[PDB]
């Protein structure tokens, strides 16, 4: 996360690295997702709108999962073995995030709904707990 | 239990405030994505959606409720705003009906929330100084 002894850190630098290794370079990708009449002017305006839209699309999902302002955020949703039966070592040491995305693509929407429901339940439970004071 | 018949955008609009509070993520997730004449309307629509979402997010942020669906605050409820009981608000009212009631007092509540959040931040800074 702070790159002690890293050869070099750059946008998508750890794209071919394993998920475990690429998980220590999230800051590198995260900080480049927002910064980087004539025909060109319209194209630039469309590009800016697209960038804002794409950034906010992920930011909203992070917000409604309770992971706002976090790069690695643990959740209360247990991992259903049906989504992927590979061992933890088989995922974080012998696989890359690009390969992983191709495996859990079919189950992404199911996971997202579970995360949203879990966050809502956590918020309600916290409200109830605080109401006892 | 978790046995919702079906969850959809605004599906709980007719349910009580208590029951509709369990479907916040249903609405929250559809607030961002539910030249020619048609080419400019689409761009304006996209920009407008982004602006509205960011306005709501900013209001949440300055209240200390950033990244929260149900956020509790330190602002006591004023009986002037609404004298109805808690039981008759969360079990005999829909959010649509409630909104039409606390509308002349929404700006007052927003200002109170902002002031309280600022005071909380200042107090937290003061306390951290001692440590």
């Amino acid at each position, epitope marked *: 996360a702070v790159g002690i002894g890293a050869v070099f850190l750059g946008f998508l630098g750890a794209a071919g690295s394993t998920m475990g290794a690429a998980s220590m370079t999230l800051t590198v990708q995260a900080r480049n997702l927002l910064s980087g009449l004539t025909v060109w002017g319209i194209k630039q305006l469309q590009a800016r709108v697209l960038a804002v839209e794409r950034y906010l699309r992920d930011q909203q999902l992070l917000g409604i999962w309770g992971c706002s302002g976090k790069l690695i955020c643990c959740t209360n949703v247990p991992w259903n073995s049906s989504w992927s039966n590979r061992n933890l070592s088989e995922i974080w040491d012998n696989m890359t995030w690009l390969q992983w995305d191709k495996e859990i693509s079919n189950y992404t*929407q*199911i996971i*997202y*709904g*579970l995360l*949203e*429901e879990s966050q809502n339940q956590q918020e309600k439970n916290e409200q109830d707990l605080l109401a006892l004071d | *239990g*978790i*046995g*919702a*018949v*079906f*969850l*959809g955008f605004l599906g*709980a609009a007719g*349910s*009580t405030m*208590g*029951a509709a509070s*369990m479907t916040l*993520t*249903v609405q929250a997730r559809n607030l961002l994505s539910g030249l020619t004449v048609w080419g400019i309307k689409q761009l304006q629509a996209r920009v407008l959606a982004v602006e509205r979402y960011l306005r709501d997010q900013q209001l949440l942020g300055i209240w200390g409720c950033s990244g929260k669906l149900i956020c509790c605050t330190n602002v006591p409820w004023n009986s002037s705003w609404s004298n109805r009981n808690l039981s008759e608000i969360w079990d005999n009212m829909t959010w649509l009906q409630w909104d039409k009631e606390i509308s002349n007092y929404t700006q007052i509540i927003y200002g109170l929330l902002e002031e309280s959040q600022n005071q909380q931040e200042k107090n937290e800074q003061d306390l951290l100084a001692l440590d």
Partner: antibody
Amino acid sequence: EVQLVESGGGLVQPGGSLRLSCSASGFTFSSYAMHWVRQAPGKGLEYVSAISGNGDSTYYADSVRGRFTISRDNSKNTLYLQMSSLRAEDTAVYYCVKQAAYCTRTSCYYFDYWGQGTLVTVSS
Amino acid sequence: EIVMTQSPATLSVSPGERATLSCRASQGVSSKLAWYQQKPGQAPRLLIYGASTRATGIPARFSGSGSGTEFTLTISSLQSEDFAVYYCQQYHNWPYTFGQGTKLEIK
């Protein structure tokens, strides 16, 4: 195994009242929505009413809205349907039905199991 | 309200052949279609959900296919106990709607 047994059906005069009960066993009753589906003689199945797992939300078909009342007793694993001011067109075979799954980002109102069904006849 | 159209109203196929049952929706219901079998004097039994997935305990003879507006149910190896009215249900738009049914006759 999942079992749903209906009861309470019978002959009722028009404008009368009738209550059906469905005892469900073999699954977590409170975690699944329960529907009432009726099949008028010589006609296909049609939706009557539905209720969520915890019973907060109840849904009614336009024809029966304001006259029927669906309720559940999670403790006793029972599902009720209280009909009032019945009409001649309410005669059918009422099935207490279990929703197959509970999904948040999609629609899942397909039915894993159906009760045997009880005939309700409205006539003078 | 989505209207589900089932054709043919009645179908007669001798045992051992393939029987194809078709269901049509007034508007696209994605892949959200379910098939039920109702033998006389019995409650309907779920066969297919999602238009292609087979319910637990359903033999491999029943095969479902289709997406959007056109759906079909295929019974590769008809048997003497497949005589029943088959209903197609859409769970895409509330309220859910059932087809009028397709009586299958043992020729």
